[PDB]
Write a protein that binds this ligand. Structure first.
Ligand SMILES: C[As](C)(=O)[O-]
Ligand SMILES: C[As](C)(=O)[O-]
Ligand SMILES: C[As](C)(=O)[O-]
Ligand SMILES: C[As](C)(=O)[O-]
Ligand code: NA
Ligand SMILES: [Zn+2]
Ligand SMILES: [Zn+2]
Ligand SMILES: [Zn+2]
Ligand SMILES: [Zn+2]
Ligand SMILES: [Zn+2]
Ligand SMILES: [Zn+2]
Ligand SMILES: [Zn+2]
Ligand SMILES: [Zn+2]
Ligand SMILES: [Zn+2]
Lengths: 65, 307
């Protein structure tokens, strides 16, 4: 994980995901939004913004289903 | 008030659903009965509907909805399936043939305490409402409480976790009540436990990567089922083992039912893929139930033709 506050804190063309303040590729941002209506993550810690527990699963913040 | 005046296109309370159970039985007394399989942690009755055209201990299909209380489209779909069975039996030939050989058991509100709590206190509640010694966090994940891979990787030891497995397998009376029913019956041939959301149809295992012995048949049936589902509105479901399709999950229902020799053990995740998630608009209840019913029919027909 690389933490960020804006896109200029990221590397390799990655963007800052504002909801969880982590860097992610555009492809991963697009995939998590399109496939799962959610945000990318590297670990469970990147999914803590919801009071109702979510998990990091397969690169996106998932609900328990 | 009758089951014809009931509004299938809106979400209901526990009391309203329980009224629907009674009206359906009263309207169809020779097809439908209501069985109390237990009482919840907080003392509420737990009810299963039996749909049967006769016989003794006939081969049977079990369907449950609402094991996770926040998954409201599942309970709403279960109400619709119940009405659907009574509508089609004697009218639609194919379904008539199904119920002439098989019984169907349907548990619409599988976690009544959680369901009450989702209306009263916390719309996003998932778990049971049991108290746990040594914690102020309430509830056990009823889909981590079964005695198949219980307490292994794929569940949490933290009572505050959404996937807390409980102190021991079958600690939750809501789970134990089904266990007792299933073992006493001894002749359930398919067991389908319905969740939302994500648009998936899954088969064992959740707790390990080893392929289930009937993997290929179950994967073949899954493809046929999701194809039937898709025919109505084009809703896309993926399919596979629980562990491959979602994540590792231990002590889950269909791993236990499969271990009881119930070959056609399936779990659904209904609409949607996350746009609304658990808060699916009420205008999607009936379409969701309709398309899901097509998948259920595929499974029932396969069960019928593989006796
Ligand atoms: C409490 As009532 C009017 O839904 O039976
Ligand atoms: C068999 As009767 C009591 O429903 O007329
Ligand atoms: C045939 As009847 C409706 O009296 O049970
Ligand atoms: C028609 As078949 C492949 O489900 O036995
Ligand atoms: Na208990
Ligand atoms: Zn995905
Ligand atoms: Zn669930
Ligand atoms: Zn009518
Ligand atoms: Zn009412
Ligand atoms: Zn009432
Ligand atoms: Zn009668
Ligand atoms: Zn309510
Ligand atoms: Zn088949
Ligand atoms: Zn076959």
């Amino acid at each position: 994980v690389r933490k960020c506050l804006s896109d200029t804190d990221c590397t390799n063309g990655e963007k800052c995901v504002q909801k969880n303040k982590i860097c992610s590729t555009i492809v991963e941002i697009q995939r998590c939004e399109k496939e799962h209506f959610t945000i990318p993550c590297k670990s469970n810690n990147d999914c803590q913004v919801w009071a109702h527990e979510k998990i990091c699963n397969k690169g996106c913040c998932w609900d328990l289903l | 008030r009758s089951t014809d005046t009931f509004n299938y296109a809106t979400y209901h309370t526990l009391e309203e659903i329980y009224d629907f159970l009674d009206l359906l039985v009263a309207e169809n007394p020779h097809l439908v009965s209501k069985i109390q399989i237990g009482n919840t942690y907080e003392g509420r009755p737990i009810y299963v509907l039996k749909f049967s055209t006769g016989g003794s201990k006939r081969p049977a299909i079990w369907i449950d909805t609402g094991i996770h209380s926040r998954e409201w489209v599942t309970q709403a779909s279960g109400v619709w399936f119940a009405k659907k069975i009574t509508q089609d039996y004697g009218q639609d030939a194919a379904f008539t043939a199904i119920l002439d050989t098989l019984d169907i058991f349907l548990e619409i509100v599988t976690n009544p305490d959680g369901f009450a709590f989702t209306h009263s206190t916390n719309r996003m509640w998932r778990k049971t409402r049991s108290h746990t010694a040594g914690s102020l966090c309430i509830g056990v994940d009823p889909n981590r409480n079964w005695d198949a891979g219980f307490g292994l990787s794929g569940a949490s030891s933290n009572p505050c976790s959404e996937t807390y497995h409980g102190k021991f397998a079958n600690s939750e009376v809501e789970v134990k009540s089904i266990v007792d029913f299933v073992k006493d019956h001894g002749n359930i041939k398919a067991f389908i436990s319905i969740h939302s959301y994500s648009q998936l149809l899954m088969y064992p295992y959740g707790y390990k990567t080893e392929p289930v012995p009937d993997q290929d048949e179950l994967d073949q049936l899954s493809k046929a089922a999701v194809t039937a589902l898709a025919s109505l509105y084009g809703t896309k479901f993926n399919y596979g083992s629980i562990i491959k399709a979602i994540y590792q999950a231990s002590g889950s229902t269909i791993d236990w039912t499969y271990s009881q020799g119930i070959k056609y053990s399936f779990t659904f995740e209904l609409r949607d893929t996350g746009r609304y998630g658990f808060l699916l608009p009420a205008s999607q209840i009936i379409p969701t139930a309709k398309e899901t019913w097509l998948a259920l029919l595929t499974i029932m027909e396969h069960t019928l033709n593989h006796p």
